[PDB]
């Protein structure tokens, strides 16, 4: 059971991403859920269509609005997910700075207090760790 | 595929356009693509002949079909094998029922199969195939069963 609550939803392969009533976009995987992104605004999920390389919202209006699914964050907390640490490592090139040290906090709520010591780019992260 | 902008008419491009995809359905490959059927005037031979060298036989049942005529109908299709003699009519539920399969496979190398058929309330089939080659034999008993 998921701790933010799905006004709208969508299946991107098994992961769900949906959108909150929080206007938080969150990602359910393995029973957990993550933030993707924060909408600043109440969005509704069209659909993803695959030719645009989006996601495309709208808002009160009939028109178009684009987020882009953040992929890379995605396959690092999934692989986190599946207990697969290493694999999730080699997505951490491609992580940035803090997102590092955040993706790392993901790995460490799953388990491996080190493997998340390497890619936490904070050295605070590394030294509790 | 690129998108440039298109003003309906039949084409019409614009200046600067995105790259677009657009999906489409998977695109299935049967044996039957592989083959070319052909019935033989005498199986026995054909069936010898091609080359009993690759030979290589499995049983299978198939349990959806409940007589021999559907049984001949269904390997006849999937494999793109004419079954010989106009064995597709065989007689209504004998017990024992020898079907003679022919056609060519690609490269033009002749590929047989034969498949002796034991009817109980369900079809059976001990599948023998011969061919010039050790790939029409393995294609057709791993495509039937």
């Avoid at chain 1, 694999?87 to 491609?94: G, I, R, S």
Wanted: aromatic share 8%; with cysteine; net charge negative.
């Amino acid at each position: 059971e998921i701790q933010e609550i799905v006004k709208t939803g969508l299946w991107v392969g098994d992961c769900f991403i949906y959108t909150s009533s929080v206007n938080r976009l969150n990602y359910y995987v393995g029973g957990e859920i993550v933030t993707i992104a924060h909408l600043d605004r109440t969005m509704y999920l069209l659909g993803y269509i695959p030719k645009d390389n989006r996601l495309y919202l709208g808002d009160k209006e009939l028109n178009i609005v684009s987020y882009s699914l953040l992929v890379s964050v995605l396959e690092y907390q999934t692989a986190v997910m599946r207990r697969d640490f290493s694999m999730a490592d080699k997505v951490l090139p491609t992580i940035p700075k803090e997102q590092r040290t955040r993706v790392a906090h993901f790995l460490e709520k799953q388990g491996f207090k080190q493997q998340a010591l390497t890619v936490s780019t904070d050295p605070e992260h590394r030294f509790e760790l | 595929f690129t998108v440039k902008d298109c003003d309906p008419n039949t084409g019409e491009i614009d200046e600067e356009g995105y790259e677009d995809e657009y999906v489409l359905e998977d695109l299935e490959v049967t044996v039957a693509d592989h083959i070319q059927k052909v019935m033989k005037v005498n199986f026995e031979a054909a069936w010898d002949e091609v080359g009993d060298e690759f030979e290589k036989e499995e049983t299978f049942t198939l349990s959806t079909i409940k007589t021999l005529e559907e049984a001949v109908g269904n390997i006849v299709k999937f494999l793109g094998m004419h079954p010989c003699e106009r064995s597709d009519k065989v007689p209504e539920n004998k017990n024992t029922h020898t079907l003679l399969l022919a056609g060519v496979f690609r490269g033009g190398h002749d590929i047989l199969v034969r498949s002796r058929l034991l009817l109980l309330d369900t079809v059976t089939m001990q599948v023998t195939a011969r061919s010039s080659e050790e790939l029409p034999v393995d294609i057709i008993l791993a495509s039937v069963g």
